[PDB]
């Protein structure tokens, strides 16, 4: 296929537990001071998820292809915006319409096209020593793009492209759902402050976009970025620095909750209707 | 009361007949708040179009279509829509709007139809048999016909087979008909497919070049994003009118609210799981719905043999001898300061009787 | 060719049951109103058969 990266000591995955995550509103209507029960694609309380590491500062770079099931909950713990974008598709061999959602430092590019992806897709920036500037140099995503159905180009902006090290200080929350082909993305940012694992807490979720595709998505993959600097030996085939970040992926399954609404009509407390007979 | 009881002698008591409802007066319809417009200014009016064998395909997506912006800056000659009425292009939405722009002669316009024969419809641009779209043709003797002579427009004369619908064929090779293969000698059985037209300003109106743009779309297929125009109304409040808010049909009094919502969802329901409030989708204002269908009517009689006059009890009505009780609004009976024994029960400690020149007192 | 039989194709409104329509008017399709000269966007309501 294409070129790949070497000296990749892939650790075995570890299974951890999440604590009351994935509680979003039923529909487009507000209700107040009233208890109402629905059936949507949720995470059950106290479930087991899979933890994938991306810390190198060691020698860990793993980004496998995950199959797209009936709702994927995505919480991301970042400190320097390591996770750039996502790709969606079935086979990724320029014969199936592929969705590519990338958050570049200049534009937000969303393209539903027929792309050709390689074996190991990633991103790469270069940091100079004589000048303090972050420029995108290595862009090893695709070879060619011929056919397209959709293109979404946003406004130009500026990002710092941080590459510092330390503890996690962002919590990015993405909720991917499909009802009748409508791709429903839900966004939430939380300024967390802890070292590792997953923090505990309770919060509601806000909408982002409802992009109306009509394709069948089977698999997806999350692309990372590499820092090329003075710590590299001097080659792009073996010298890399992924950074230090962690992302949590959980698959949604249709539960039933009871939601408590205050005077402002937001989610305050959720009761799982089948976890134990007291909550039942 | 007689047609309620189905009798001719009505005994003393309170009876129920019907209900007082208030009819709506106006009907306001919202929806357009999005200022996006499809680029019609280059489709029907360009600097130079293309030939019939090499027509230009333009994709129209992520905008709002309109019909009234077509007859204010351009005059046409031929306008025919196949498979759809031209007056149904406003309420109905569209999917996959494609425009095929090509320039032909004035005698070839009738050959561009879904189900004709000839040369152009079989060798240049094949139309489908179940075609659903509009065909727009107009005269343009301004840019397509040079005063010194324009011969840049070409058409295909010789081809091996026919064409599929929505197929473009561009070839500049020498056509071969029989034996002695040519590869360019310009001899016997060596045909050139791309032949020149005869667009001259010295001829008649039939030899003038005509610009034909065919709009093709789909109906009731795929998640659409480009719909047609929509008429909008004004906003009226504190009146029981009919309305339509984001597809929800409601009729009632839209009073001002004292609560605020969150800026991503639209409607509002109360403790009873029914609609109590709605956000205005144009002015972003929370409006409380309350319909004007409240109350019933009740008839008080002293008896048929006693008198032929009544008192009328309006149940949930705020208010000759109009008196408001705690049980409702009473018309046809006067309130007295004296307290008698109760004869006909009404509600909330009010009773009516027939005392003293005599009337019904409450 | 037998072109002696006609039918109504364009009409502004619909019809009630048990009613025959005799008089025909020049139908207007969108803008450019006709007012009885039948110019642009003025289709005829009566069309022949095949």
Numbering used by the authors:
A (entry chain C): 14 to 70, 76 to 298
B (entry chain B): 299 to 617, 640 to 676, 689 to 694
C (entry chain A): 447 to 496
Sentences reproduced from the published study:
Finally, analysis of the spike/Sb#68 complex dataset revealed two distinct populations. The most abundant class showed an 1up/2down conformation without sybody bound, which is identical to the one obtained for the spike protein alone. Cryo‐EM map of S‐6P, with an 1up/2down RBD conformation. No densities for Sb#68 were observed. Structural comparisons revealed that Sb#68 cannot access its epitope in the context of the 1up/2down conformation, due to steric clashes with the neighboring RBD. Sb#68 cannot bind to up‐RBD if the neighboring RBD exhibits a down conformation due to steric clashing. In order to bind, at least two RBDs need to be in the up conformation. Without sybodies, the spike protein predominantly assumes an equilibrium between the 3down and the 1up2down conformation.
The spike glycoprotein is the most prominent surface‐exposed entity of severe acute respiratory syndrome coronavirus 2 (SARS‐CoV‐2) and possesses the vital molecular machinery required for recognition and fusion with host membranes. The spike protein mutations that cause increased virulence and immune evasion are predominantly found in the receptor‐binding domain (RBD), which is specifically responsible for host recognition via interaction with human angiotensin‐converting enzyme 2 (ACE2). Here, we present two synthetic single‐domain antibodies (sybodies), designated Sb#15 and Sb#68, that recognize non‐overlapping epitopes on the RBD. Cryogenic electron microscopy (cryo‐EM) revealed that Sb#15 binds within the ACE2 interface, whereas Sb#68 engages the adjacent conserved cryptic epitope.
